[PDB]
């Protein structure tokens, strides 16, 4: 079982029991994150699209096939998108007989040949035109529709046909916020999932104050954001990731100390020094006198404390010179063997 802070290293490295030395560690967390969206100025205009399916049963056998299924978009057979924002749902009607006889039948969509998914069009996907339909049109992919009875036998009932073209005009939206004249959102101070000028990632967004005239997007040479700027003012913002890797020392099948970069306590350890280019977190004593592992310029001792490394002593005498004084000339000798 992986609950304790040493057992999680064994879960990470896929190994029972670990050799002594320095190991890396970065424990991610799965969670649900809020979402921000900042884009160039444009007005707001919305449209809604359902996709219903209504069925009846009882022909000659139940388990073989349903009796009749109807498919419709908003009551029509085709709907084109002429506005700037949209959103799609999927609705299955179980109240056909009043009592839901549809409690056993499971009707749902599959994934067809389209290069995107149906349940992820409501995210911030950008197109040029779409024009959904439910009858056959040349040059169009499809999402099949499947029916079954307690997941024993499968059958195909209908489809959903969709065309498109690439662009940057029409954008999906999760849910129709009403009253806002210009759609944007911004969530500060803890980890989000941003979509800022068509850059997508995660991180923490903070506010600052610097006097930089020029661009509205600051990137590194690997394609990540470092900071953007609001248009109608001069304030900038800072974007940093919220998972920093570490260095963990392992000895005698336990954790001794860590080399962190965050000023707080960490995995089971309490005390905290402050070295000239990181923070060191351990819980040992301060009376140790001998070292068991090494790093750049110190030695981690047996219980966690730090010992600096001393240079080797060496004595030497120079070239004797012509002088009227007292000198030192060697008399006795011994041997030694070197390899």
């Amino acid at each position: 079982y992986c609950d304790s802070p040493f057992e999680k290293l064994q879960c990470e490295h896929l190994q029972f029991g670990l050799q002594d030395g320095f190991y890396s560690a970065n424990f991610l967390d799965d969670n649900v994150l809020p979402e921000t969206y900042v884009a160039l100025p444009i007005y707001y205009q919305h449209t809604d699209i359902n996709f219903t399916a209504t069925a009846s049963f009882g022909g000659s056998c139940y388990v073989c096939k349903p009796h009749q299924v109807n498919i419709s978009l908003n009551g029509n057979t085709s709907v084109c998108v002429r506005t700037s924002h949209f959103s799609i749902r999927y609705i299955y009607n179980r109240v056909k007989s009043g009592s839901p006889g549809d409690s056993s039948w499971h009707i749902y969509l599959k994934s067809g040949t389209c290069p995107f998914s149906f349940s992820k069009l409501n995210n911030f996907q950008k197109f040029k035109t779409i024009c959904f339909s439910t009858v056959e049109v040349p040059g169009s992919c499809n999402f099949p529709l499947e029916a079954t009875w307690h997941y024993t036998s499968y059958t195909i009932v209908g489809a959903l046909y969709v065309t498109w073209s690439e662009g940057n005009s029409i954008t999906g939206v999760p849910y129709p916020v009403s009253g806002i004249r210009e759609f944007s959102n911004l969530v500060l101070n803890n980890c989000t999932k941003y979509n800022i000028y068509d850059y997508v990632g995660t991180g923490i967004i903070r506010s600052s104050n610097q006097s930089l005239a020029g661009g509205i997007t600051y990137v590194s040479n690997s394609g990540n954001l470092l900071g953007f700027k609001n248009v109608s003012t001069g304030n900038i913002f800072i974007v940093t990731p919220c998972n920093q890797p570490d260095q963990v020392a392992v000895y005698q099948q336990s954790i001794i100390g860590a080399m962190t970069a965050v000023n707080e306590s960490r995995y089971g350890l309490q005390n905290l020094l402050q070295l000239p280019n990181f923070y060191y977190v351990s819980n040992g004593g301060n009376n140790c006198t001998t070292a068991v592992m090494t790093y750049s310029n110190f030695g981690i001792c047996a219980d966690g404390s730090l010992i600096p490394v001393r240079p080797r002593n060496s004595s030497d005498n120079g070239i004797s010179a012509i002088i009227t004084a007292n000198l030192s000339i060697p008399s006795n000798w011994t041997t030694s063997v070197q390899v």
Binding site: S84, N168, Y197
Partner: protein
């Protein structure tokens, strides 16, 4: 002030409007040391004396480029320009380090705009790209009026009316009028170029797809003019415009080549009011078969209104198209205006751009009637004609910094 024609870029036997960094007033001083604040200098020397001019900041640095000019008059004008790093006069990295033999009796000069160092030399105009050269604000002058050395100091962005007659600059007058002309009017150089140091106020990049944000990138854009018609004052009784500057009302500015063009860049004059910026009228095109009528309104049942907003707005407008094919009036929907309408571009091969984005596409356009009813003439800044060329653009925040 009597410069050449090549130092100002005007034609022969005309009267233009020139904007930019231009000299205004001469000095006559003998104080032998003065720290000014400036962006340039002109001077005239005939006197046998050392005369040295130097631009610098207010503190010494070991990674800054300094400009240093020294005249040593012999039989001609011996000028030594040295844009070099210094070591407390130990030059060790020189972008330029030259020696010019110049005609006596002709003034020289340096101006700075951005990271660009111009160089006026009475016969050419040479251009250097010094890194981090916007910081050079101060000016140290070693010039003596007793040895017949006079000099002027350039502050900023003067609007000058210039009159020429047979290669001789006759008049030279500074506008105490001419508000706002420093950002929208210029004079066309040789071979239809656009002069350096012009802040592109409403000059957008055109596109069929996405919009660029930042970075340096080659393009293919309409930036070679053949005319420019400043302050047109178009009315309800002007007529059509036929894609060439050979009519009866066209008053071009600077050079004027006769050719056939591709686009017509309009430019909109708008104030911070949102009540006087609501102009009433249509736009009438002229295709090969039938006329196309464009207008905008604020309700989706657009049968009761005809307006076009300028500048900033407060609620969305909807824009339509009429046509007529044998008493069968046809209407359609095109899109929404952006929140600030600034520029309208019409090409010959059908297309129609608003702030650099294509809305619709006709077949073939011959003339445009911009029919707006107004009680004044103050609606437009300029109307330009252009052709496609190959450029290199420094885009910053969806605008243009430089042009090459």
């Amino acid at each position: 002030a009597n410069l050449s024609m090549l130092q100002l870029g005007v034609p022969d036997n005309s009267s233009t409007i020139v904007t930019g960094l231009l000299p205004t007033h001469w000095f006559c001083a003998n104080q032998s040391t003065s720290v000014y604040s400036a962006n340039g200098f002109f001077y005239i020397d005939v006197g046998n004396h050392r005369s040295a001019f130097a631009l610098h900041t207010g503190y010494y640095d070991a990674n800054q480029y300094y400009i240093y000019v020294t005249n040593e008059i012999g039989l001609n004008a011996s000028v030594t320009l040295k844009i070099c790093k210094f070591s407390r006069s130990s030059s060790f990295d020189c972008i330029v380090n030259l020696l010019f033999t110049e005609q006596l009796g002709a003034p020289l000069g340096i101006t700075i705009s951005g990271e660009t160092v111009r160089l006026h030399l009475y016969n050419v105009t040479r251009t250097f790209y010094v890194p981090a050269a916007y910081k050079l604000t101060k000016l140290s002058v070693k010039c003596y009026f007793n040895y017949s050395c006079v000099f002027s100091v350039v502050n900023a962005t003067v609007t000058v009316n210039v009159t020429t007659h047979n290669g001789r600059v006759v008049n030279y007058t500074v506008c105490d009028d001419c508000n706002g002309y420093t950002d929208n009017i210029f004079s066309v150089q040789q071979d239809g170029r656009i002069p350096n140091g012009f802040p592109f106020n409403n000059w957008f990049l055109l596109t069929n797809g996405s919009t660029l944000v930042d970075g340096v990138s080659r393009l293919y854009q309409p930036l070679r003019l053949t005319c420019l018609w400043p302050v047109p004052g178009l009315k309800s009784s002007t007529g059509f415009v036929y894609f060439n500057a050979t009519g009866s009302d066209v008053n071009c500015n600077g050079y004027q080549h006769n050719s056939v063009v591709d686009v017509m860049r309009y430019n909109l004059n708008f104030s911070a009011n949102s009540l006087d910026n609501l102009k009433s009228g249509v736009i009438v095109f002229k295709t090969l078969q039938y006329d196309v009528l464009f207008y905008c309104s604020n309700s989706s049942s657009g049968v009761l209104d005809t307006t076009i907003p300028f500048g900033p707005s407060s609620q969305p407008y909807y824009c339509f198209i009429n046509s007529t094919i044998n008493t069968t009036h046809v209407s359609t929907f095109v899109g929404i205006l952006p929140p600030t309408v600034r520029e309208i571009v019409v090409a010959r091969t059908g297309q129609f751009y608003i702030n650099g984005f294509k809305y619709f596409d006709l077949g073939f356009i011959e003339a445009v009637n911009f029919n707006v009813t107004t009680a004044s003439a103050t609606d437009f800044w300029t109307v330009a004609f252009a052709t496609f060329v190959d450029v290199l653009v420094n885009v910053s925040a969806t605008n243009i910094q430089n042009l090459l």
